[PDB]
Symmetry: D2
Subunit: 334 residues, 4 copies
């Protein structure tokens, strides 16, 4: 069993904790680090607006939180430099605060005693970026020590894009992600550096930028320069879809697009990318463990222009992709 | 004054009523026909979850509703063959029931005394389909008698597509509309012919089909065969955006796409199509009177592939387009 | 195994189906009757906006639905006189259509071969109405044949009211329930017999009436004449709270009110009524199996006037109460 | 015309501005003070998620915002001490930041050159607190210089309570306000000093405390000690109802309760308190200018226990009550 630390016990952090509890047999979260008091953290762990109640007893004191009788050490450094991950024999830290997406900052955890850092976001200066199922075979146990698991949207787009680009080739593509609102947005109209994200999230369609389509190039260099996109944030609390419109030189039909996905979506890669012909709506992919759920009912073709749609639970889907990556790191040389 | 009748006093029927109150100097609604009772009709007219309170006194009795002193005669024939439009001198009927979009059925209003029918929706077997500002000059006041005002989505897409096709030529295009939930969706999971629209509308992203991308070809025949799309229904009560991605042979930038819309978005056409550089979200286009509000901020270009996005108030924008069309009709012949 | 039939495979029907899968070792649903087609029925069973995906394979044909290998025969008689419950050895019918809450009609299931009917709602002319944990010991397996499980709100209010009336005596009480929107409300402003439930449910606070406060008197006759109330429907898809304000002759504090609930909320009764000191919001009681979750944090006292508040999942909590009741019935006679 | 300053150009501030534009013939907002840049403020003024677009042209530069051609000076002191209200001949400042509800702080505006301060919230240390229509006749032009307009909920409850207590007498009462979510709440589950307000506001019924019922005693001292309550925040963006259950010694019916309200709700007091028999839902009282809209359809009576319900637009209703107060202050000795 490899012992894991979380820095940042927020949505993604608490998601990751639950995912380990629900899904892993060989990782154990033994310590976490957060600014806030333990009563607050343990309350948010116990009760979740999206995931429901944790199915286990939660206790806390000032040093720790105990879940189903397993004691978690909780620290509260704003500066990872002050941590001691080595005290708990922690091999992997999940960096999920959002204030260490720069790897030059994040590697403080290595200094502070960890052997690996996985940043739960697009990163700068990292050793490598992965989308599990797409380019994880290029993981280098020796040289890849501070990595990124990319973004939720990238974990949706990249798998679908790989299959279609491998089978037909993508010349150019433009994405709209119709996306659940997220914590960066406001509840009521209020100042924000992005004047659209300033507007009441739960009553508005809110357009906003995203790097997620250009970031595909990080895990699929053959697509560099070829994809771009934006997001429409809408009033659901989780659950998103990525709508990609692309040109191919191939001559293709709705049927051949769909068969390529169904063909690819099997075995291990089938845990990242699913193929569906069901009458899906967003609540049906809430708590879905795939990074990308391809909706074959939505595929359109006009000449050499193709529109495909994949779903993702931007919280849980992403988290399960990150946990898959974490299992790889844990299964190899530390 | 030209006298107007409305058949089907629902979202669009009551939108249209209010638009006439607010926006028209020469039309008057004098009769309405609807299946339900006048207590209900007048409560829903007075109080509206989207448009708010009518600014007028509303009273009812057994066969009329009176709005700001003006008596509106109210009928309740489920079959329009039983209506007497001539008894009130109704020139134009707005057919907004959703059940008479076949013009072969809708013509029952003409037999019933009306001179013109405008179907508030995509129609079949109609004389003509219009998107005001796009092809209304082809309106033939002799031969165009039962006409369609097309769909909300088409009244968004077409003004935009016309301009850009005129300027750069569109080879192929695929559309997604991110659309407010509509009254045919279910509040709780419940049977529907469309097993996705069966799902609780206010907590789901709900994919559905739309004809709008094809139906553009009725009003811009140059685009027949070139557009397809679908809709995503999302939890806002009104307001929608049309996202079109397309190919051109021209060499284009964001700047050149945006400049073409801006140069076109003026005079009378500018009341159909707006050009905006504002930081818009859906609530900002609620109760906007344009059919299409082009968001210059969302234009993207990759190679010869363009993404453009236009907003519309699928209720009030559509209604204001339909009223433009009605005003045109009411400004010409009206024989027989 | 006792064999169960469900008449009306809607929110409650499918809740009940799932509760039996999840929670019962001795009941089995073997037949269901519903007006709509099996493609729809099985899609709505498999995928649920509230409960999520059924954890089982679902297949259908023209007269059955098969769930995890187990074939469920499906009928579609709008009139229960046409059903043959005996053909499948159904002992107990769950009547969850909403259209047969008159026991004089509901008894049509008994004639059709069933030995017992449980109406998932307030009923008329019924043998007996129960809130499990409150008065189910008065269940008479000879003479209680068509029975009601009362309303979601009553299954929240009664366990609480019993305890406090037993301990301090309730003189008078008025209730407000802040309640999730339900399937009979309209998504968009649209005709409804109740002109407030006509209004778009997901963007309004909608006042409506409820019998729950009076109907408590069926199961706690000591409270007849003493309670009234109304509901506020609010934009959450499930989860509700009952806010009761009442007078006692006892001298009470917050501490003493709360201690009475806590001492009562144990053993079997504790699975009906929970006592909580947690910082609860509605999403925390979604899929809670209790009929009533007393929130100790919301208790207020002024003079001899007490305010108490209890949460309930108007879908799953009610269903789990109804299943408790069904298990009781299935544990006794079942003649004829 | 009396010239007005706003400190805090937030929801309530921008509401107040609009209200002056829409409703007053003798007040002019000539200056405002806020931390944020003018592009951001002018964007939020122009476009509102609840009130819709301002019906006038809005321009800005670094010193000002111009609305329909009228230039508003905009400052950006976090410390009112640094303002100069006297430069613009500003007589009344509306204190709507939320960081000067202590009058000992708020009177900095008097030092900084104003003659009157109206705090748009429950206040401490104020000269007086008013609910317009209830106790505004006790306003003292000479000695009441830093005042409070109370809370939205108090502006709903107090008028109804006065009429019922005057006509029947209230011994004791307990309130539930079913209230729109507000900007103090979170969009996604996140730390908050109130662990219920920590939870995703637009998918939850959220119980929370309020002083609004005890504060009635400030404007109706006869009710001191007699009322208390709490709030249930629900997923609407504005619009609220106050549900008051009370004991009276009188013997009373639904009909006599309702007739007392209808009797009182006339003339000037009728602009604060309305009487309605319509089939109201919350969207029907959005943008309603009354402080309290009594719903006679909801009145219940059991023995000597009474339940009444009044609606309020917690933003606009409150603001129009505050504007009424401001007109009183402006109409008297400065
Ligand atoms: N849809 C999603 O929620 C989503 C999807 C993909 C990626 N992500 C990414 O995951 C990351 C985390 O996002 P989130 O939604 O969980 O955020 P969050 O705000 O919910 O969680 C942040 C947590 O970090 C803690 N924290 C902040 N600074 C700290 C510090 N210096 N030291 C220790 N603890 C600190 C806070 O107390 C809080 O508990 C972000 O980079 C985000 O982009 C989120
Ligand atoms: N976003 C939109 O809401 C939108 C946009 C564009 C077009 N439309 C179209 O407008 C039309 C009307 O839709 P709506 O949204 O107002 O629907 P609605 O259901 O809100 O209104 C329908 C009205 O018709 C009445 N009615 C039904 N059958 C009738 C009959 N046989 N005779 C008389 N009255 C009858 C009903 O009582 C009701 O008042 C439809 O064709 C719809 O597609 C709607
Ligand atoms: N919160 C709740 O949803 C709630 C709580 C307590 C009690 N109930 C009660 O449960 C009952 C069912 O309500 P629901 O919410 O499941 O409603 P629903 O409308 O979701 O389900 C009704 C089902 O009955 C079917 N049906 C209708 N008429 C029929 C007929 N004549 N024969 C056969 N099938 C028929 C419909 O096709 C549908 O599948 C009602 O009495 C309701 O008051 C509901
Ligand atoms: N439902 C309601 O919205 C409601 C109802 C009744 C009362 N109120 C009260 O009104 C007050 C304001 O609330 P709001 O909802 O408008 O808040 P808000 O957060 O929307 O507005 C606050 C504004 O103040 C500005 N600001 C903050 N500190 C400042 C400083 N030191 N100097 C200058 N500007 C500063 C901010 O930039 C922001 O623009 C609060 O006391 C609130 O309780 C609100
Ligand atoms: Cs901590
Ligand atoms: Cs003609
Ligand atoms: Cs029997
Ligand atoms: Cs400023």
């Amino acid at each position: 069993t490899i012992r894991v630390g979380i820095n940042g016990f927020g949505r993604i952090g608490r998601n990751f904790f639950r995912a380990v509890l629900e899904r892993s047999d060989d990782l154990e979260v033994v310590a976490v680090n957060d600014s806030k008091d333990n009563k607050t953290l343990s309350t948010l762990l116990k009760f979740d607006s999206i995931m429901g109640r944790l199915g286990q007893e939660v206790e806390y004191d000032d040093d720790s939180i105990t879940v189903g009788g397993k004691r978690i050490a909780v620290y509260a450094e704003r500066d990872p430099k002050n941590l001691d991950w080595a005290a708990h024999n922690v091999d992997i830290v999940i960096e999920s605060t959002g204030f260490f997406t720069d790897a030059n900052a994040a590697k403080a955890h290595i200094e502070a005693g960890a052997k690996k850092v996985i940043i739960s976001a697009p990163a700068s200066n990292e050793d490598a970026t992965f989308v599990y199922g797409v380019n994880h075979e290029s993981y280098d146990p020796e040289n890849h020590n501070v990595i990124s698991g990319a973004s939720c949207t990238t974990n949706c787009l990249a798998p679908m894009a790989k299959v279609l680009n491998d089978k037909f080739g993508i010349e150019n593509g433009l994405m709209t992600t119709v996306h659940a609102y997220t914590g960066d947005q406001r509840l009521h109209d209020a100042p924000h550096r992005d004047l659209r994200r300033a507007r009441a999230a739960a009553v508005n369609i809110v357009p906003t930028s995203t790097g997620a389509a250009k970031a595909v190039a990080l895990v699929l260099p053959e697509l560099k320069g070829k994809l771009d996109g934006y997001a429409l944030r809408v009033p659901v609390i989780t659950g998103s879809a990525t709508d990609l419109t692309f040109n191919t030189k191939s001559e293709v039909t709705v049927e051949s697009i769909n068969a390529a996905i169904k063909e690819a979506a099997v075995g291990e890669f089938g845990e990242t990318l699913a193929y569906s012909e069901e009458p899906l709506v967003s609540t049906d992919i809430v708590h879905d463990s795939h990074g990308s759920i391809f909706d074959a009912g939505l595929t359109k073709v006009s000449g050499n222009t193709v529109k495909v749609v994949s779903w993702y639970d931007n919280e849980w889907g992403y988290t399960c992709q990150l946990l898959r990556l974490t299992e790889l790191v844990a299964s190899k040389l530390l």
